[PDB]
Design a protein around this ligand. Structure first.
Ligand SMILES: [K+]
Ligand SMILES: [Mg+2]
Ligand SMILES: [Mg+2]
Ligand SMILES: [Mg+2]
Ligand SMILES: [Mg+2]
Ligand SMILES: [Mg+2]
Ligand SMILES: [Mg+2]
Ligand SMILES: [Mg+2]
Ligand SMILES: [Mg+2]
Ligand SMILES: [Mg+2]
Ligand code: NA
Ligand code: NA
Ligand code: NA
Lengths: 66, 178, 151, 63, 63
RNA sequence: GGCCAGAACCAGCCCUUGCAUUAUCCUGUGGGAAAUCCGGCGGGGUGCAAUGGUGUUGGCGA
RNA sequence: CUUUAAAUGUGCAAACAAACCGGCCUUAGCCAACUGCAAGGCCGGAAAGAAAAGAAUUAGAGGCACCAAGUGGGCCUUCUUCGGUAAGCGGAGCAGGCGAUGCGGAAUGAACCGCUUAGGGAUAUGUGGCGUCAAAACUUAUGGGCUCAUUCUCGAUACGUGAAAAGGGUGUUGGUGCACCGGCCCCGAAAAUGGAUGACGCUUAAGCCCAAUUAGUGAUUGCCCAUUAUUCCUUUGGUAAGGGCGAGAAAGUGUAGCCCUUCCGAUGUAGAUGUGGCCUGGAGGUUAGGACGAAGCUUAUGGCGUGAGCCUAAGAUGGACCGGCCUCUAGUGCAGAUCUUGGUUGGCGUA
């Protein structure tokens, strides 16, 4: 009343194929990594965002003036 | 009928390499149905003896050898075949034909009939024509006597294909049906 | 018969003949950065931070570095799809990988060719295929045949 | 071009044969492949190779 | 033209892949006169395998 | 009656020697009368190419 | 048990969110320090966009979700195997099949061999065959050898269903100055209804092992048979592809398809879905029929549709009601449940 087999399983698995892995640049979360480096990275990202806002404002002013 | 084998000559080599910049060239004689089988037998012999596989080799030429004029000669065929529980066996037989190819085809049919040996288990060592005074068997020696003659008995002579009949008259050549 | 962590590893986790011993100093001095390609090969003589027996021959990429540990991402097929498993091991059980060596050599060679073309030097002549034909002059010729002594 | 190539090969072979050397021919570059068996009881690997070669029916041919 | 296609295929030109990928696979008829044995190699007296330049007579009864 | 037959014509489709290699070859001039056979010298047969239409003549149908 | 160690395997990489080459900005992150290393960005440059060396190929559109069915007794075979004396026995690994599937062959067989399936022609093949049954050598050859078998028994289509040691006849083979060692045949070889190379029969085979294709005459395929291949006609559906807007043309999912051309696929149990798909009783509308005959009933009554079905004809039937189309609605389709009720029936002019 208890039987085990692996007969049809490979065919079933390959019907809709073995899907490949997600590219490494996606779902690239950093949670659980080394905290001392994580904190410094966060500070640098904040500075970068401020810089991007300033750059856009400068672009807008230049286009308007000339 | 004409013989069902041909006489081929295959010349081959191993592809030159750095360890082997000037390889040796070999010459091989084989009786085969066609040149693809000739090449296959060549590469089998090269692998079995010289440790050279077909995948690192070169075939320089394959050509079919012409035969001599039609003359009745005695041929010595040196042959060897394989069968289980007997090992390899080597035998020498004398035939009586008009060409080397004919003698070798006779030998193949004889081996197949008497020992159940097949083409891929037979190997031919030598074939040559010997003079009439070197024959050591009476069954072949009796055909070069100076006063040889015999009648034709038990002849089952049929008709031309266009004249065959199913029913004919009892003491007549008249066809009744067909 | 039992689903233990280290079941059936008698030959897998075992030192080679006359090569027993703890890791060397070059292993200790090797440098691993995030984004490198590494091989995961267990060292039986460490026993701290070993990977599971599934990951003993796999190659992956580094996503995390700690004081004495590495984080590697490794693919694993489970039924109809492939997972991205993240394993934490000590630094003795990983080894830098030469799987991109040929690609990097190709890139360097192309850059060298570009530099030579810009400079104006003469490039080496291109290689010749071995599948062409020509006249063969043989030093030795033999006869290939089965002889009586062969059997 | 075809006639010239054939003639050139003929002269080269004759030149080698007169001196007693051999001529090695250039290896074949093209093959023609045809399928002689039908579609039944084929392993997955060979099935994929035939699909990649574009021989999905019997007596299909490719270069 | 069609002679361009024939030349590329025959000589394995620089556009061999383009010319052959732009074609449908060839669909031929069975060989008139029959085969020999589809279950043996050509060397053994059958049909499958590589038969060198003897494939031309095989195809001349199928095209 | 395009109801049934015969012949004819268009289109399409099925069928129905050349050049390479020619030599372990060809041909004259000690052994077993001659031939088969073995050394000397001289002269030279198989891989590619060449159903659809457009009327016509009878039968049956008053 | 062990260093040595395969064949078949198995992970990763092979230029467009990647990587390369020199400014600059930010962070303490590391270091005694930095312009060194780490990390995130901005700017500028190069780019056989991947050469040559056997240097890929594709009937090669990637990714992401939602809702739900059936199934959860399997079995056979090839190789690998553990238990068991063994087994048409129990347990596993890899793959292919049957289940869910016919068709052409093995005389017969779920699973072997070939081939895999819309409705039909022609041509050619696969497996298997060419003495009759039974299509094909009207018993082919201008091929070579071997074999005689007196009551289940000479042989003679694998899977698979007839046998061992030992011993002898006819054709041959090593050795040599008799021994052995193979081909065919005989002995070894004993059961219960009468019987099985499928049957008859066959021996100058219609048996066995090789080999041919009209025969030493000279290029190429002896011939017979598929739901397969090629080609032609018709249907149906597309992840469909183009064109147009004397009888004819509707800007169009689906029809009696708006019209024309073109290419590819078509089997299927449990199961899913679609259909200007068929049918039955009633309701809101619309259009019609009937005493010059409604519904119902009968059929060698034809016509139409792949089909469910629809329509006409005749009644030497009947005597008062009812059809089509668009919506709405339901007690809406029967061959079988030891189905329910009513009628009939063979056994039977019998016991
Ligand atoms: K079960
Ligand atoms: Mg056949
Ligand atoms: Mg069932
Ligand atoms: Mg089947
Ligand atoms: Mg007949
Ligand atoms: Mg269907
Ligand atoms: Mg169903
Ligand atoms: Mg009701
Ligand atoms: Mg009736
Ligand atoms: Mg009901
Ligand atoms: Na179930
Ligand atoms: Na039979
Ligand atoms: Na009923």
């Amino acid at each position: 009343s208890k039987n085990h087999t692996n007969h049809n399983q490979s065919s079933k698995n390959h019907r809709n194929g073995i899907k490949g892995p997600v590219p490494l640049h996606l779902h690239n979360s950093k949670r659980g990594s080394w905290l001392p480096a994580l904190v410094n990275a966060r500070r640098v990202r904040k500075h970068n965002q401020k810089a991007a806002l300033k750059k856009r404002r400068e672009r807008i002013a230049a286009f308007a003036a000339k | 009928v004409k013989p069902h084998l041909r006489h081929y000559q295959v010349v081959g080599r191993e592809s030159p390499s750095e360890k082997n910049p000037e390889p040796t060239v070999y010459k091989f004689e084989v009786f085969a149905p066609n040149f693809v089988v000739a090449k296959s037998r060549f590469w089998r012999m090269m692998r079995v003896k010289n440790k050279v596989k077909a995948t690192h080799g070169d075939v320089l030429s394959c050509k079919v050898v012409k035969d001599a004029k039609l003359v009745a000669r005695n041929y010595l065929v040196d042959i060897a075949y394989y069968s289980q529980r007997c090992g390899y066996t080597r035998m020498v037989k004398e035939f009586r034909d008009v060409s080397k190819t004919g003698a070798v085809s006779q030998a193949y049919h004889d081996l197949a009939s008497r020992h159940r040996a097949r083409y891929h288990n037979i190997e031919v060592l030598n074939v040559k024509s010997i003079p009439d005074h070197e024959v050591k068997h009476l069954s072949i020696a009796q055909y070069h006597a100076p006063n040889l003659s015999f009648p034709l008995l038990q002849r089952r002579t049929k008709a031309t294909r266009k004249d065959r009949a199913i029913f004919v008259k009892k003491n007549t050549k008249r066809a009744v049906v067909a | 018969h039992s689903y233990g962590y280290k079941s059936g590893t008698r030959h897998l986790f075992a030192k080679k003949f006359r090569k027993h011993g703890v890791p060397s100093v070059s292993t200790i001095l090797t440098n691993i950065k995030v984004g490198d390609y590494v091989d995961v090969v267990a060292d039986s003589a460490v026993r701290e931070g070993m990977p599971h027996k599934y990951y003993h021959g796999r190659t992956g990429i580094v996503w995390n570095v700690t004081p004495r540990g590495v984080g590697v991402i490794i693919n694993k097929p489970v039924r109809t799809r492939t997972l991205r498993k993240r394993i934490c091991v000590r630094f003795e059980h990983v080894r830098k990988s030469r799987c991109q060596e040929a690609f990097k050599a190709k890139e360097h060679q192309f850059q060298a060719y570009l530099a030579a073309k810009k400079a104006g030097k003469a490039l080496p002549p291109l290689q010749k295929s071995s599948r062409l034909g020509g006249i063969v002059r043989p030093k030795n010729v033999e006869v290939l045949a089965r002889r009586v002594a062969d059997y | 071009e075809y006639r010239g190539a054939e003639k050139k090969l003929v002269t080269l072979r004759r030149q080698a044969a007169s001196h007693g050397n051999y001529y090695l021919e250039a290896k074949p570059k093209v093959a023609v492949v045809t399928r002689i068996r039908g579609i039944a009881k084929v392993n997955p690997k060979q099935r994929k190779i035939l699909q990649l070669l574009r021989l999905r029916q019997i007596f299909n041919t490719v270069f | 033209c069609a002679e361009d296609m024939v030349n590329q295929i025959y000589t394995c030109g620089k556009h061999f892949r383009t010319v052959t990928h732009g074609m449908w696979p060839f669909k031929l008829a069975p060989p008139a006169g029959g085969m020999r044995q589809k279950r043996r190699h050509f060397v053994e007296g059958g049909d499958y395998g590589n038969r060198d330049t003897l494939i031309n007579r095989f195809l001349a009864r199928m095209i």
